[PDB]
Design a protein around this ligand. Structure first.
Ligand SMILES: N=C(N)c1ccc2[nH]c(Cc3nc4ccccc4[nH]3)nc2c1
Ligand SMILES: [Ca+2]
Ligand SMILES: [Mg+2]
Length: 223
């Protein structure tokens, strides 16, 4: 997250860190046994780390659970990143408490202008590399599709939306992929892609979760 602030320990209780010997992507807990992340974060051998704040220090509120199965969206296209979403089932159910909570799925899509909270342990420099150990947060609004499509001609589908600042300065970045974009208490997006980080006229692109609620509900109930 570039231009954001330190969230504070466990203030984003549904945020998960996907680890395969190191942190490589974020995710969101939707219920005690399931996590939603980005399909491009797919790897075999994932351990889900819940209740984290500093990912390099065991502070006492963590729960590290291995994944029993991963399901990438049936129509995920790695070349365009269309349908960039995946579900991960935990080997054991997590214990929900103050520090570990699930986030609600949306009943409708959000409007341009809605402010959202984006979080993650990704790079914090637009030009440079600095990976933080504690969770960073960013409040950003959903942008109009017109400004989104003008920034990325021929690359935005109906399963994506842009959020951020066209002026640059504030944005999600690599290391943040798969993490949550929560607006009005619902999970509306998943950090997916962009062009560099915090560049002018290059906002972040997110998977539009409201288009996948039926697939999510159906898939978790059958697995
Ligand atoms: N500015 C952003 N909001 C941004 C978020 C995440 C991200 N991740 C990458 C690198 C990146 N681009 C791809 C394309 C396809 C598969 C993986 C992948 N990783 N850039 C970005 C940019
Ligand atoms: Ca920790
Ligand atoms: Mg994240």
């Amino acid at each position: 997250i570039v231009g954001g602030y330190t969230c504070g320990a466990n203030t984003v209780p549904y945020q998960v860190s996907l680890n395969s010997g190191y942190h490589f992507c974020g995710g969101s807990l939707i219920n005690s046994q399931w996590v939603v992340s980005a399909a491009h974060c797919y790897k075999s051998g994932i351990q889900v780390r819940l209740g984290e704040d500093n990912i390099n220090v065991v502070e006492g509120n963590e729960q590290f659970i291995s994944a029993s199965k991963s399901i990438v969206h049936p129509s995920y296209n790695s070349n365009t990143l269309n349908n960039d979403i995946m579900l991960i089932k935990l080997k054991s159910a997590a214990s929900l408490n103050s520090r570990v909570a699930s986030i609600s799925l949306p009943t409708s899509c959000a409007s341009a202008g809605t402010q959202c909270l984006i979080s993650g342990w990704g790079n914090t420099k637009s030009s440079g590399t600095s990976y933080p150990d504690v969770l960073k947060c960013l409040k950003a609004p959903i942008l109009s599709d017109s400004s989104c499509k003008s920034a990325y001609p021929g690359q935005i589908t109906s399963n994506m939306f842009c959020a951020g600042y066209l002026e640059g300065g504030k944005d999600s970045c690599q290391g943040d992929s798969g993490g949550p974009v929560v607006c009005s208490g619902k999970l509306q997006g998943i950090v997916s892609w962009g062009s560099g980080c915090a560049q002018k006229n290059k906002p972040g692109v997110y998977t539009k979760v409201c288009n996948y609620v039926s697939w999510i509900k159906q898939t978790i109930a059958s697995n």
